[PDB]
Amino acid sequence: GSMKTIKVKNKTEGSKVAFRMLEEEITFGAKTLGLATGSTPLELYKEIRESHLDFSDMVSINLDEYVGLSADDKQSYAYFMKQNLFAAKPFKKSYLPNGLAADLAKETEYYDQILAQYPIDLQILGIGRNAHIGFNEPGTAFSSQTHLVDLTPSTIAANSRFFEKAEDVPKQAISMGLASIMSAKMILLMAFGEEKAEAVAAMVKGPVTEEIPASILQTHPKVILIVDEKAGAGI
Ligand SMILES: N[C@@H]1[C@@H](O)[C@H](O)[C@@H](COP(=O)(O)O)O[C@@H]1O
Numbered sequence: 001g002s003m004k005t006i007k008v009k010n011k012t013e014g015s016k017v018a019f020r021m022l023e024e025e026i027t028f029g030a031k032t033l034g035l036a037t038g039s040t041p042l043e044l045y046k047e048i049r050e051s052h053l054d055f056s057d058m059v060s061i062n063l064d065e066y067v068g069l070s071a072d073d074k075q076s077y078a079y080f081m082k083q084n085l086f087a088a089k090p091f092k093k094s095y096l097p098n099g100l101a102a103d104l105a106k107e108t109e110y111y112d113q114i115l116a117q118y119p120i121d122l123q124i125l126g127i128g129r130n131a132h133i134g135f136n137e138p139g140t141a142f143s144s145q146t147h148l149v150d151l152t153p154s155t156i157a158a159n160s161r162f163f164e165k166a167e168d169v170p171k172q173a174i175s176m177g178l179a180s181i182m183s184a185k186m187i188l189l190m191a192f193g194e195e196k197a198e199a200v201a202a203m204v205k206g207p208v209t210e211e212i213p214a215s216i217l218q219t220h221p222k223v224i225l226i227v228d229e230k231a232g233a234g235i
Contacts (some may be wrong), residue, residue, distance in 0.1 A: 003204070003223040007232050011192040014226045015043040018124070018190055021224065023053060025122045025186065032059045034123030034181070035085075037077055040190050041124055042084065049088040058091050059118045063134040063181070065097035066170035067104065067148070075162055075170075097146070097174035104148050107174055111146035115180060123184035127191045131199035131212040135175040138211050144177025178216055186222045189214075191231040200227060201234030 008014040018041070022033075033055075035041075064077055071078035078096045086094055095114055101107035130138060135149045150172055151159075163169045181187075191200050203214035204225070217223050227235070 001221055003218065003220070003225060005204075005225045005227060005232065005235065008226060008228050010228045012043060014190055014192060014228055015041075015047060017226055018044045018188060019047045019051070021188060022048070022122065022124075023051075026053065026058075030121035031057070032061065032118045032121050033091075034061045034063070034120040034125075034176075034184055035081065036124045036126050036190075037062070037064065037080055038126050040126030040192065044124070044190070045084045048085060051089075053089060055089050055091040060086075060091045060094040061115070061118065061120060061176075062094075062096040063176040064173050065099040067099050067172040067174060068168075068170050069099040071096070075159065099170075099174065101174070104174065108146045108148065111174065111176070112180070115146075115176075115183065120184040121186065123181060123187045125181070125187060125189040127189060127196055127199050127203065127214055129195050129199055131202050131214045133178065133181060133213045133217075135173050136178055136181075136213045138213060140178055140210060140213055142178045142182075142208075142210060142216050145180050147175065147177050149173045149175045178213060182216060182220055186224070187217065187220055188224045188226065189217065190226045192228045194230045194233070196227075196231035197233045200225075200231050204235045 006017055062077055066076060069076040097111055098107050156169060160169045202212040203217055206212050206215055208215045208218055
């Protein structure tokens with residue numbers, strides 16, 4: 001069934017709450033974490049880095065990797081995760097899609113199998129401005145598992161700034177789908193700023209439609225939404 005909301009003043013305070021909750025899940029037996037990228041968990045990550053948490057018997061799973069990038073590429077999500085978390089607080093094993101996979105359909109099948117092998121205890125998520133979840137854009141099937149995503153033109157244009165040559169900018173990603181993500185025992189979603197207010201309301205109040213990827217979270221048995229006052233204006 002259910003979705004608890006914690007409303008908070010701001011991002012910093014929502015990030016402290018997320019930290020406290022993470023630490024409890026871990027003390028109560030969580031071993032596999034699904035992780036988030038983007039701006040939303042950056043302060044939660046700094047807090048973890050400076051904390052006494054120890055992920056050395058734990059496994060982490062990220063949603064996404066860019067096709068064509070290695071883990072050492074500065075533009076990769078593997079590298080993002082290293083910088084913001086793994087260098088300071090390594091896991092037993094941290095999984096991301098292999099963006100260098102020879103057979104994209106084989107890597108997608110592989111990632112599903114890793115999910116089956118390490119089901120996620122706690123998944124951290126952000127939300128997109130159009131209610132996208134990971135790289136799953138409106139119209140994505142609620143049945144989707146790991147799959148090849150063509151990046152939005154806004155994403156390619158944004159990421160283009162970071163590559164000397166245009167022929168080197170990823171146009172695609174290997175991404176956990178909506179059914180993939182929904183398999184977590186517990187989901188903690190964080191949303192801060194007015195830019196998220198509309199996606200937040202649609203996730204909570206709108207119908208369950210592929211038009212709002214996050215609306216599937218309405219059907220998860222254990223979703224915890226942490227939202228600052230502005231992102232929660234609608235709920
Ligand atoms: N990079 C991100 C996703 O990984 C993220 O969860 C979401 C919101 O991004 P942010 O947390 O920067 O607002 O949209 C993009 O696709």
